[model samples]
Target: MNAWDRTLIENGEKITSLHREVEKVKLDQKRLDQELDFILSQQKELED
Candidate 1:
C-alpha cells in the first residue's frame, strides 16, 4: 500500500498558502477602513 505521505504534505502547504493570502486581505481591509475614517473626519472638520 502507498504511504500517501506526499499528498498529506502537499495539502498542508496549500492550506498554509491560502491562510497567508486570507490574512493579507484582512489587513488590507483594515487599512481601507482607517483611510475612510480619516477622510470622514477631515470632511467633518471642514463642515464645522
Candidate 2:
C-alpha cells in the first residue's frame, strides 16, 4: 500500500475511534445523572 492508502486507513481508524468515544459519552450521561441526583438529595438533607 502507498501513502494514500495509509492515510485513508488512518482516517478510517480515527473515525471509528471517535464513534466509540461518542458512545461512551452517551453511557456516561446516565451515570452522571444518577450521581447528580444522589448529591442533590444529600444536599437537601443538609438544608434541613
Candidate 3:
C-alpha cells in the first residue's frame, strides 16, 4: 500500500466521523424543537 492511499482513507475516515457528529446534532435539534412545540401548546399558570 502506498502513502497516498493511506492518506486518502485517513481523510475519508475523518469525514465519516464528522458526518456522524452532524447526524447526532440533527437528532438532538429535532427533539428540542418538538419539546418546545409541546411547551408552547400548554397553558401556563401565573402565581401571585
Q: Which residue pairs clash in candidate 2?
A: none
lDDT of 3 by residue, 1-48 (tens): 799999999999999999999999999999999999999888677795
Q: What is the lDDT of candidate 1?
A: 0.90
Arranged by TM-score, best first = 1, 3, 2
Please write out the lDDT profile of model 1 over residues 1-48, one tens digit for every residue: 255988888888999999999999999999999999999888754453
Indicate whether candidate 1 or candidate 2 has the larger lDDT.
2
Clashing pairs in 1: none
Candidates sorted on lDDT, descending: 3, 2, 1
Please give the CA lDDT of all the candidate structures: 0.90, 0.94, 0.95
State which candidate, 1 or 3, has the greater lDDT: 3
Report how far off residue 37 is in candidate 3 (Å).
Answer: 0.2
Q: Model 2: what TM-score?
A: 0.58
Residue lDDT tens for model 2, 1-48: 999999999999999999999999989999999999999888754453
**Between candidates 2 and 3, the lDDT winner:** 3
Cα-based TM-score, every candidate: 0.77, 0.58, 0.76
- Judged by lDDT, which candidate is best? 3
Under the 3 Å rule for N, CA and C atoms, how many clashes does model 3 have? 0
